From Swiss-Prot, chains A, B:
It comes from the Bacteria. Catalyzes the base-exchange of a guanine (G) residue with the queuine precursor 7-aminomethyl-7-deazaguanine (PreQ1) at position 34 (anticodon wobble position) in tRNAs with GU(N) anticodons (tRNA-Asp, -Asn, -His and -Tyr). Catalysis occurs through a double-displacement mechanism. The nucleophile active site attacks the C1' of nucleotide 34 to detach the guanine base from the RNA, forming a covalent enzyme-RNA intermediate. The proton acceptor active site deprotonates the incoming PreQ1, allowing a nucleophilic attack on the C1' of the ribose to form the product. Binds 1 zinc ion per subunit. InterPro entries: ArchSynthase1/Queuine_TRR (IPR050076), TGT (IPR004803), TGT-like_sf (IPR036511), tRNA_ribo_trans-like (IPR002616). It holds the Pfam family TGT. GO terms for biological process: queuosine biosynthetic process; tRNA wobble guanine modification; tRNA-guanine transglycosylation. Belongs to the queuine tRNA-ribosyltransferase family. It comes from Zymomonas mobilis subsp. mobilis (strain ATCC 31821 / ZM4 / CP4). This is Queuine tRNA-ribosyltransferase. Its cofactor is Zn(2+).
């Protein structure tokens, strides 16, 4: 099997569909990655994650380096063996989560020193340490160590932040290439920064393309800017990236965010929304989200969604799941999560099929008209 | 399929093994019933409950009448359809749980009035209402409405309590027999009381046998008396019950409690221990229980138990489950629960096989020597 081979089978406008072939499996694009921060997709066995249609999951350098530890996972055989998922795993590099979750941080050209949110102990991240951690975990897609610029930012602060990220991108490339086993078996993605500014996004794309990566993420979005502004930035930013490599929009998003981002050339997505909001009682349907705890569902015998093919919708009613979530029962979290991840995967499948068949424009219009009715 | 047919295939001493045939399936005895108080065996899909080997699960009149409500469950098609378990369900009658969990109760010859532990609202239980609720739920094995005498009790207080329970047993019989669909499709078990007193246990057995039931439970135990005293009471109490009907020890118990109770003629068991203590980090093994959160398991690649055939032990290490439970991850609760229920079912299987093969005495000795080493 290839280390990493991306093939575009069809296009419609800026939208693309195809496959990434890797040693541990094929990734169909556009792809949605369920989030598995602490070496588990919350409330699902890996076999259930696979049954929903997921080809790849996301893990986190920041969380795993703190608990259970990167060296410990490596001693136990790597992340895949540890959690029982034998297909591709992409790991974020720590650059975003350290600044989001740490109580205290010190930032410099070398990297970031920080206090753990679990117990206050002191730790360090850098391009070299992030790549090493991802090696110890056995990631298949390694993310460069970057800085996610806060929003809003002045042009000059966005520029200096982006420039640091580009120096860190080169250090990430070099650290990855030095580790022969990692360079032979994994892939490395760079992360574009530049906040909402077209000229900075161009400078960042140029720097990443000069280094060369297997894929290119659009970083620095889903940080409070809202959909209109995110789409405006995507309109000019995605065309700056190499066309022949995958484009990954980090942390996005709601179903309509995904559809619009695909219309703008994005191939890969991750988001906690289906898992987290599932546990909180929000179920996705083709007619929009529903709050299953609402009293209107107490005697509703219909499945969560009338068309969904998932195992939850084949077997259990809204009324039962309403009861489980209101009672705080673990099975409620399990069933809501499986349905929401299955729904996300069915959305990605309809996106892939409609692009391949040259009817994605109509799909997006029909999707929105019904979802927002 | 028969409504209810018990057949004893083999005996060793006081121990028996056989089958109860019912419309919704066969129950192999001695049997362990996982507890599914709120219309779910906590953290398991019904298909997973079945995969562990369980033939029957337990539900609770008290919890279900409060949430989601008995009439609501009946409107939605009955408990089996609601939760997705199509095999036999035994429901406790409310007599124990109302006194265990209610904040305020009023007891009389008619029944028990009480305040719900969920919201304080006022409700009533009685022999007639308990049987009606169990009818609305669609229980397969209906328990008589009784009173679980507190421990310790004076002989005279135990006697007056037991006598009330025996009058309630006759009222339960009559209410059940009046409901033609219930009498045709379900079974009714009586509950022996009498605290720790041989003469009262005899009077209670005589009263229940005169009425006639499909099965006979030993009530009033697992109320703080300890194993030595529970076994002493079982020594004289079980032989008082009709030999040709199943004997059900309510709320028991730890693995050694089950083995000793089988040696004294018990055929059926239920207990929250495998589920509840599983979620808390206790795993059962043939070498005794372990606390998976203990630091000694942080890098242990062995399964929870070295012989167990369950899906958890085929796929995941102690080290991974240690991480999940310490992190508060739902998958930890799921995996611990599946293993513990599977372990309980494997214990029951070894008990059944050893009785059938006439080597149960040796099995009990070998079990204890290793479990308590
Ligand atoms: O909307 C909310 O926002 C969060 C996800 N948003 C997000 N933006 C990201 C940007 C980056 C980045 O620039 N760099 C690296 N390395 N990782 C990233 C990860 C990101 N995640 C969720 O809370 C979601 O609900
Ligand atoms: O040991 C602890 O004690 C609890 C279970 N013990 C228990 N004894 C019971 C007795 C009766 C009874 O007499 N009547 C009816 N109707 N139901 C019953 C249910 C019972 N459950 C758990 O907390 C266990 O950990
Ligand atoms: Cl999540
Ligand atoms: Cl439980
Ligand atoms: Zn579904
Ligand atoms: Zn096991």
């Amino acid at each position: 099997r290839p280390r990493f081979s991306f093939s575009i089978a069809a296009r419609e406008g800026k939208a693309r569909t195809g496959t990434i072939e890797m040693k541990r499996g094929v990734i169909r694009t556009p792809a949605f990655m369920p989030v598995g921060t602490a070496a588990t997709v919350k409330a699902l066995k890996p076999e259930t994650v696979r049954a929903t249609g997921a080809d790849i999951i996301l893990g986190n350098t920041y969380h795993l380096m703190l608990r259970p530890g990167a060296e410990r996972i490596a001693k136990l055989g790597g992340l895949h063996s540890f959690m029982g998922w034998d297909r591709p795993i992409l790991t974020d590099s720590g650059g975003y989560q350290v600044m989001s979750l740490s109580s205290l941080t010190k930032q410099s050209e070398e990297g970031v020193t920080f206090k753990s949110h679990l117990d206050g102990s002191r730790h360090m991240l850098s391009p070299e340490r992030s790549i090493e951690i991802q090696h110890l975990l056995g990631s298949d897609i390694v993310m460069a160590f970057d800085e996610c610029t806060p929003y809003p930012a002045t042009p000059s602060r966005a520029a200096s932040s982006m420039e640091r990220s580009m120096r860190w991108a080169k250090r990430s490339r070099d650290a990855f290439d030095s580790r022969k086993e990692q360079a032979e078996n994994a892939a490395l993605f760079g992360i574009q920064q530049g906040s909402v500014f077209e000229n900075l996004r161009q400078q960042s794309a140029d720097a990443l393309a000069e280094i060369g990566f297997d894929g290119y993420a659009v970083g620095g979005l889903a940080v409070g800017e809202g959909q209109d502004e995110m789409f405006r930035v995507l309109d000019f930013s995605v065309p700056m990236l190499p066309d022949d490599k995958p484009h990954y929009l980090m942390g996005v998003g709601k179903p309509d965010d995904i559809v619009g981002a695909v219309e703008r050339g994005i191939d890969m997505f991750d988001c906690v929304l289906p898992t987290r909001s599932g546990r909180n009682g929000q179920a996705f349907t083709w007619d929009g989200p529903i709050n299953i705890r609402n009293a209107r569902f107490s005697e509703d015998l219909k499945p969560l969604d009338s068309e969904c093919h998932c195992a939850v919708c084949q077997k259990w009613s809204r009324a039962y799941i309403h009861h489980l979530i209101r009672a705080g029962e673990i099975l409620g979290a399990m069933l809501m999560t499986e349905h929401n991840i299955a729904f996300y995967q069915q959305l990605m499948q309809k996106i892939r099929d409609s692009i391949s068949e040259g009817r994605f424009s109509q799909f997006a219009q029909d999707f929105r008209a019904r979802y927002f009715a």
